[PDB]
């Protein structure tokens, strides 16, 4: 099956000073957002009608309450211990947790945390593991967190028992959107000159879903190894944009074409031909 295969929640907690901190959160299928966190109300925002997966309203509310309590207590305790952990304000903590389905059907879970944009800890085998980037501070944190009653048991249940069944239920519930097929459009432009006597040709591919795609500059049937893929950029509304460029000598651009392959096209590739002398 195509489309996303993982679910995760993220946390960004921004500590301005000892008396002011704010947290942003959201839930994602790969990089498709399906949950927002509303700090006005302390509840989630469900971005798609199927965002609750197969969970009942009752369990969803219970999870929102877990997250609301966690968000408050996390800020409270970080501020209380900031002196003992020799924290200098402002600082920012990040977290990501969730699970993913692999070939063969196994679901693996993860939890990662960061301080200052650098890895700080992870959860392995339901254990807190300090990352070397986090130094003694992370060793201090892990030894402290596992003594707070119930935190580690809630994390283990959420990671290894709630997440896998949530993921399967929501992949199924959202399949009309998650496994839909959206055809790309493509066009050509003459991009930034690399240097003297040379040209950069640009093949743009925009509006495709799912994410995997194949774009190559061609001379007839020969794929130009010089093809350079840019990074996949998001559009609004769950499609992607991609540039493929080729740096060519002034008088060698004639004869080039761009070929696009995508799962939506049912085997009918897009082919654009570069024409010389400003004939587009």
């Amino acid at each position: 099956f195509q489309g996303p295969t993982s679910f995760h929640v993220i946390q960004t907690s921004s500590f301005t000073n000892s008396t002011w901190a704010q947290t942003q959160g959201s839930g994602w299928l790969d990089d498709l957002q399906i949950h927002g966190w509303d700090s006005d109300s302390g509840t989630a925002i469900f971005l798609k009608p199927w965002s609750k997966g197969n969970f009942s309203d009752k369990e969803v509310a219970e999870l929102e309450e877990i997250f609301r309590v966690y968000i408050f207590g996390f800020a409270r305790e970080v501020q209380d211990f900031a002196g003992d952990f020799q924290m200098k304000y402002p600082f920012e903590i990040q977290g990501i947790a969730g699970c993913e389905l692999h070939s063969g059907g196994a679901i693996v879970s993860f939890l990662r945390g960061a301080l200052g944009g650098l890895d700080f800890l992870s959860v392995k085998n339901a254990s807190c593991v300090p990352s070397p980037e986090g130094g003694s501070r992370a060793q201090k944190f892990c030894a402290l967190i596992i003594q707070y009653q119930g935190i580690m048991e809630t994390v283990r249940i959420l990671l290894y028992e709630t997440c896998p069944r949530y993921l399967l239920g929501v992949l199924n519930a959202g399949k009309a959107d998650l496994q839909r097929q959206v055809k790309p459009e493509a066009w050509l432009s003459s991009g930034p000159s690399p240097g003297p006597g040379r040209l950069q040709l640009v093949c743009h591919v925009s509006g495709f879903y799912p994410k995997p795609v194949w774009v190559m500059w061609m001379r007839g049937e020969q794929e130009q190894q010089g093809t350079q893929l840019g990074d996949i950029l998001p559009n609004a509304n769950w499609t992607w944009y991609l540039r493929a460029t080729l740096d060519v000598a002034d008088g060698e651009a004639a004869g080039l074409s761009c070929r696009v392959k995508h799962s939506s096209l049912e085997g009918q590739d897009i082919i654009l031909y570069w024409r010389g002398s400003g004939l587009n």
């Binding site: 921004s14 402002p90 944009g117 459009e185």
Partner: protein, 99 residues
């Protein structure tokens, strides 16, 4: 802690055809911390109806955001993305370029 400055990428959703409604995207990424200010500009002036994504971050913990709005490209009008961040002493402006 080392702060990371934003990368800024400006692109239209559709090939620019003069006088045809389109969507202008500004992708701001690679930055840390998350506090940032992003505007889309038309001839240097701020565009008011601009939408943007909720905060997210990449595997290396750098933050990224998409800002976008409807626009109609012309020949003379100029569009840009202006970003401010703690890593920048002055706002950084990246203009949109169809070619």
């Amino acid at each position: 802690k080392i702060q990371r400055t934003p990368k800024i990428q400006v692109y239209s959703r559709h090939p620019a055809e003069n006088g045809k409604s389109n969507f202008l995207n500004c992708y701001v990424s690679g930055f840390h911390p998350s506090d940032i200010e992003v505007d889309l500009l038309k001839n240097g002036e701020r565009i008011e109806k601009v939408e943007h994504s909720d905060l997210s971050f990449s595997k290396d913990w750098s933050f990224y955001l998409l800002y976008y709005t409807e626009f109609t490209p012309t020949e003379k009008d100029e569009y840009a993305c202006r970003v401010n961040h703690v890593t920048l002493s002055q706002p950084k402006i990246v203009k949109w370029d169809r070619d």
